């Protein structure tokens, strides 16, 4: 816009030529003399500051064993380096301009004139140098010459560099990045005006300080025979074509082409065509290369967030210049693919359709990586042979990045407002704000928030930043934009947004519409979750569901207890959640290639080698859970046939037990629920359970067959009806299949997608009955339940549903009721624990070390064996002695025993917030000696009620053993002296405690409670005198 | 809801593409059936108006579609008249977007000038948003073609009756309101 506004800039009538030179000061920082710098700084700052600034540059630079003293350059990593650079460069600007052209470009000290403007046109036109800027070490100058001025210059140049042969044009630098007509030509007057103004400005600079180099410079002449003025300023290639000159065809159309208005005439006199430099594209590509060259083992999500920051920097900097840079569009396609396949390679599965667009581009909210995209755009490329000649326009284009269907991932451009529009909008909103305050501040109805929401993300400082927490202490932040530029010489991370700063600029972009449009373009959050292991968590809605970040258990536990022996072991967890969650799409059946191994004991087929997926799915169907789900569903359909045991003409069908390896016999099936039924009832022909109609012909006796076999559907085959109909239609037809009735009717279940169906010969009073049965089965079973919870733990998908009340203090009476209540402490395995409050007995089953001769994991095997031994007690117990509630102390045992209590699915399993000192139970001399004295596994029946509860209550002796357990946990070498007051104060050998009378018993329990309270207060800096009833009782029993 | 599904397709096409070339080509291969072509063009306007300001994408793809088939051209002109009918309810940002797009296409002969009859210039007939959008489109086309260019094109006898309302001669009150208003424009 300043190039446009220099008077008669585009006139080439009288031979006037416009030159646009740009060059850097070639070793500007390297060559700052610290003595001259010191002297010049003393001109603008206190001599003490000058001397500090000068001394700070004279330092030793060390690398490893290398070291030298800096005597000559400037240290660029200094914090005030930018100020030295800008003042020194100002001195070089005065060298280039002279103190008259500088004082005209700058304007009077009292009324300085704005960036590229002058006070008059007599002042503007006096001198060839029209427009001038220096961006730190890079200079842009626009001269306009008379043909007399241009001629004198070219003369002096050639008379200084005489070459008769006409070898002038050979080594000239004008960019090939533009089309061949539109670049600067090879005229002699133009090539020579270029070189002559370069040479004449390069003579202006003492070569001891700096020069200009022709190879790191660029001149462009706009003359008679050259219509366009070119430059490249920051990453932008700019080609300005005026109307007067070689347009000849009135052109105002493209998104990335800026229309240059005159400030006076207001006519669009030119167009600026923007590309991105080949330096800009190399910068971005190197930046992606650097992301891709990372810690080597990073999460998919940091690879994706670093791609996202790289892409946002690129697109939000260059915005519309990206448009007409086609090498950028190809670079972006190639580089977004690169990021994706690094992520894929993170799973050893480079296959599409394992990782469809949904996996990468779905928000982090919906478990996806959240990648933004600029690659799914057709790449417009026109006929090669002619395209560089005339800017022909595009006839063909190529498919940028592949989709899954006629899918389309929203392009990130359309959510970034163009820079031209941003600057027009800003002109408007800030001009109107100027008039609004200029009008209201005297009117005393001064501007306020929501006087402005016609402009809230608007203005190039957003009209969002006047209403800021710090707008008082950001009026003092000057030079912050240089500051941010210069931070590359101080830190080794390169900020992609070095050019902007929110406290001053505002946010300047918003990509929320992008995430909602990407959800809509993926088919909405439902069509996204179709690819996910959700619908296998049985969370009824996606809505009330939130993801774990796990950033609550990174710092909260430890500072240095994490090791490199455990580092990647932790960076694998968030890829495990991601892999488990997309396994419907990752481990899908229509894969191109992959050997399709069936998992160890399950009915899951892995097509290929996804190791993380197999480990997840292998610790989800642990403990033969595929067998158990089949057992439970067939068992309970037979029990629905003990439920309707007489209404229809049937017999007792009890739990048909058969070969256990049948659920996962994925080719052939047999021997589901018992057939036996008294009389004859009239079957259908093979229809789907979906309908209800068609009860029909012949009905054979005691030949009433159903087969329920499970499945793990993929995204691309989870259609349960087709699968069940096919399974029936297949191996009822086949000979390998033992079906006692010619009506071996099939029921399918999708364990992954939680669906159900059936297809076959319906024996009347079934479809409304089996439909009922299944619709209640798929919500109720202990087996399906422990599935859904294993999956929920793997995904770390939690609802605000979390289960019934824990063992919290408000329930200390509920254990004393008529139901047999059970406790367990699976830390001390070793030996397992069972704490029965109602009876005072203990099931101290001691575990021998031979059950750990060579067993894979100590903790894992011990936790499962503890549940299995609880199950072995529940087995070798009568039915009248079995429990109903089983409170577990350590939360890890909630998993296994719930599976072990599927055969007794009546017993309640729940956690406990309360802590008990069963650890202190092994601090007793008997527990500390005898268990380690035992040679072999043995059950030790016990009694915490040595002689107590004969008269004392259950809760009363519990409130006694509470302080007993606490003073044994803490005091133990103090609780000895209470329980060892005298040699003659005796005990019984067949009980653990020495029993006294009630007065001495109470005095000793008061001492035992004092031991806990006076020992908690001194470690808690807490007085023992203001302790409340609960403030004592919550510490004495357990943990609050 | 299949019209909602086509608005899905056409929106999703626009938001998923880079240049007006790509958006247009993809749209035209979606198989837009005649009679419902306007369903795209309004979406071609709507999203463009929702954009924080002018991405020339809209005027570009539209002025490429107009000479591609003048059906969409007449549809754009008639929808411009309908927008003149209801611009009273328009927020100023979507207003400026729609107006600048229509003027940018105007300076480039992608629509007939006849559609410009929808401008009356009476103060009882001009609400605030009316004259505001008018000043916007006028400065836009006076930029896109030029001061002398517009002063030449608009004074033409072949353009005379189509500037009937915008330059009223029946009342000098209308003449004065037009003169003062347009002067306040630039």
């Amino acid at each position: 816009h300043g190039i446009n506004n220099v008077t008669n800039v585009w006139d080439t009538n009288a031979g006037e030529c416009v030159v646009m030179m740009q060059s850097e000061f070639e070793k500007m920082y390297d060559k700052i003399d610290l003595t001259l710098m010191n002297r010049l700084l003393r001109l603008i700052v206190d001599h003490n500051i000058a001397d500090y600034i000068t001394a700070k540059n004279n330092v030793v630079i060390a690398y490893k064993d290398m070291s030298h003293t800096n005597s000559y350059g400037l240290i660029r990593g200094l914090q005030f380096a930018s100020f030295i650079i800008q003042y020194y460069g100002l001195i070089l600007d005065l060298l280039l301009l002279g103190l008259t052209r500088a004082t005209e470009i700058a304007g009077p000290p009292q009324c300085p004139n704005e960036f590229l403007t002058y006070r008059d046109v007599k002042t503007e036109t006096r001198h060839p140098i029209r427009l001038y800027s220096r961006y730190l070490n890079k200079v842009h100058i626009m001269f306009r010459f008379s043909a007399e001025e241009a001629k004198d210059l070219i003369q002096r140049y050639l008379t200084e560099h005489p070459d008769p042969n006409n070898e002038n044009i050979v080594g000239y630098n004008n960019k090939k990045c533009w089309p061949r007509d539109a670049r600067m030509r090879l005229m002699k007057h133009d090539v020579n005006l270029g070189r002559a103004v370069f040479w004449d400005m390069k003579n202006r600079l003492p070569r001891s300080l700096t020069t200009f180099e022709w190879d790191n410079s660029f001149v462009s002449v706009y003359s008679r025979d050259n219509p366009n003025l070119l430059f490249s300023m920051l990453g932008f290639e700019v080609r300005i074509l005026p109307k007067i000159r070689m347009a000849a065809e009135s052109f105002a159309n493209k998104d990335g082409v800026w229309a240059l208005q005159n400030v006076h005439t207001k006519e669009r006199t030119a167009q600026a065509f923007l590309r991105v430099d080949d330096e800009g594209l190399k910068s971005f590509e190197n930046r992606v290369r650097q992301v891709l060259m990372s810690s080597g083992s990073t999460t998919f999500t940091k690879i994706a967030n670093k791609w996202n920051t790289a892409l946002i920097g690129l697109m939000t900097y260059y915005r519309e210049a990206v448009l007409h840079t086609q090498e950028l569009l190809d670079l972006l396609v190639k580089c977004e693919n690169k990021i994706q396949t690094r992520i894929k390679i993170g799973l050893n599965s480079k296959m599409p359709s394992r990782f469809p667009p949904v996996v990468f581009y779905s928000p982090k909210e919906v478990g996806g990586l959240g990648m933004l995209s600029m690659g799914h755009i057709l790449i417009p490329q026109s006929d090669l042979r002619y395209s560089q000649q005339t800017d022909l326009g595009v006839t063909h284009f190529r498919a940028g990045m592949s989709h899954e269907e006629d899918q389309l991932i929203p392009n990130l451009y359309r959510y970034i407002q163009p820079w031209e529009s941003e600057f027009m909008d800003s002109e408007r909103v800030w001009s109107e704000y100027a008039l609004k305050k200029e009008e209201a501040k005297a009117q005393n109805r001064r501007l306020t928030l929501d006087d402005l929401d016609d402009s809230w993300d608007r203005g190039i400082p957003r009209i969002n930043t006047l209403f800021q927490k710090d707008r008082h202490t950001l009026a003092y932040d000057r030079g912050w934009r240089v500051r941010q530029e210069m931070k590359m010489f101080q830190i080794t991370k390169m900020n992609p947004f070095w050019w902007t700063h929110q406290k001053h600029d505002g946010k300047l972009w918003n990509l929320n519409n992008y995430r909602t449009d990407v959800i809509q373009a993926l088919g909405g959050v439902e069509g996204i979750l179709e690819h996910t292991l959700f619908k296998g968590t049985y969370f009824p809605t996606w809505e009330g569901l939130f993801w774990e970040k796990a950033s609550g258990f990174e710092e909260s536990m430890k500072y240095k207890k994490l090791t490199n022996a455990q580092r990647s072991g932790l960076n694998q967890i968030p890829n495990r959640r991601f892999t488990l969650w997309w396994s419907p799409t990752i481990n899908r059946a229509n894969v191109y290639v992959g050997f399709q191994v069936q998992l160890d004991l399950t009915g899951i087929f892995m097509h290929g080698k996804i190791p993380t997926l197999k480990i997840s799915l292998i610790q989800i169907f642990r403990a033969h859970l595929w067998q158990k789900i089949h057992e439970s569903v067939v068992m309970d359909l037979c029990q629905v046939f003990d439920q309707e045991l007489d209404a229809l003409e049937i017999e007792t069908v009890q739990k048909e037990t058969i070969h256990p390896r049948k659920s996962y016999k994925m080719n052939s099936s047999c021997a589901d629920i018992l057939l036996f039924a008294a009389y004859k009832w009239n079957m259908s022909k093979p229809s789907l359970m979906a309908d209800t109609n068609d009860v029909y012909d012949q009905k054979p006796g005691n030949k009433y067959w159903v087969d329920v076999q499970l499945r793990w559907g993929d995204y691309d085959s989870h259609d349960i009806e087709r699968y069940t109909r096919a399974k029936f239609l297949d191996y009822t037809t086949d000979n390998m299949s033992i079906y006692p009735s010619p009506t071996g009717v099939m029921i399918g279940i999708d364990l992954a997608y939680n669906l159900h169906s059936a297809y076959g010969n319906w024996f009347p009073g079934i479809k409304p009955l089996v439909i009922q049965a299944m619709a209640k089965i798929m919500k109720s079973n202990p087996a399906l339940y422990v599935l859904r919870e294993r999956i929920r733990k793997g995904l770390q998908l939690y609802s605000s549903e979390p289960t019934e009340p824990y063992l919290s203090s408000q329930n200390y009476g509920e254990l004393f009721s008529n139901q047999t209540v059970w406790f367990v402490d699976d830390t001390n395995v070793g030996a397992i624990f069972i704490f029965n409050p109602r009876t005072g007995q203990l099931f101290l089953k001691i575990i021998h070390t031979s059950v750990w001769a060579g067993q894979k994991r100590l903790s894992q095997l011990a936790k499962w064996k503890t549940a299995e031994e609880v199950a072995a007690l529940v087995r070798s117990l009568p039915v009248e002695e079995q429990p109903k509630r089983i409170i577990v102390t350590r939360k890890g045992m909630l998993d296994p025993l719930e599976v072990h209590l599927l055969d007794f699915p009546n017993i309640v399993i729940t956690g406990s917030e309360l802590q008990l000192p069963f650890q202190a139970a092994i601090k007793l001399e008997k527990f500390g000696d005898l268990i380690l004295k035992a040679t072999e596994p043995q059950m030790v029946l016990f009694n915490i009620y040595d002689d107590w509860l004969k008269t004392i209550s259950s809760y009363t002796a519990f409130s006694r053993l509470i302080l007993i357990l606490r003073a044994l946990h803490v005091n133990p070498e103090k609780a000895r002296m209470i329980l060892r007051p005298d040699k003659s104060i005796v005990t019984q050998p067949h009980h653990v405690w020495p029993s006294l009378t009630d007065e001495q018993w109470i005095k000793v329990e008061v001492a035992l409670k004092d031991l806990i309270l006076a020992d908690y207060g001194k470690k808690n800096n807490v007085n023992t005198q203001a302790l409340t009833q609960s403030e004592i009782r919550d510490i004495i029993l357990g943990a609050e | 809801t299949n019209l909602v599904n086509l608005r899905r397709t056409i929106y999703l096409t626009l938001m998923s593409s880079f240049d007006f070339e790509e958006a247009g080509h993809k749209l035209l291969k979606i198989g837009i059936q005649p009679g419902q072509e306007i369903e795209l063009v309004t979406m071609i306007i709507e999203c463009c108006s929702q954009e924080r300001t002018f991405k020339r994408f809209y005027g570009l793809l539209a002025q490429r579609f107009c000479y591609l088939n003048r059906a969409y051209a007449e549809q754009f002109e008639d929808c411009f008249r309908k927008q003149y009918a209801v611009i009273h309810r328009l927020e100023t940002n979507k207003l400026r977007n729609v107006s600048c797009l229509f003027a940018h296409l105007l300076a480039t002969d992608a629509l007939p000038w006849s559609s410009l009859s929808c401008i009356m210039l009476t103060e009882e007939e001009t609400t605030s948003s009316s004259r505001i959008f008018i000043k916007y489109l006028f400065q836009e086309l006076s930029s896109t073609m030029g001061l002398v260019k517009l002063n030449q094109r608009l004074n033409d006898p072949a353009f005379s009756p189509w500037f009937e309302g915008l330059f009223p001669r029946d009342s000098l009150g209308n003449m004065r309101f037009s003169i003062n208003f347009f002067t306040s424009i630039g």
């Binding site: 190809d330 396609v333 190639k334 580089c335 977004e336 693919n337 690169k338 690659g375 057709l378 790449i379 417009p380 490329q381 026109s382 006929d383 090669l384 042979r385 595009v394 006839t395 063909h396 284009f397 190529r398 498919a399 940028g400 990045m401 592949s402 | 007006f20 070339e21 247009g24 080509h25 035209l28 291969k29 490429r64 579609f65 000479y67 591609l68």
Partner: peptide, 26 residues
Amino acid sequence: MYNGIGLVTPRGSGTSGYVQGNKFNM
């Protein structure tokens, strides 16, 4: 066909290598 346009090899660039004709050409 390949009437002088674009990639000669669709291997190391990151697209499937299809060149559609502009339905927007005049």
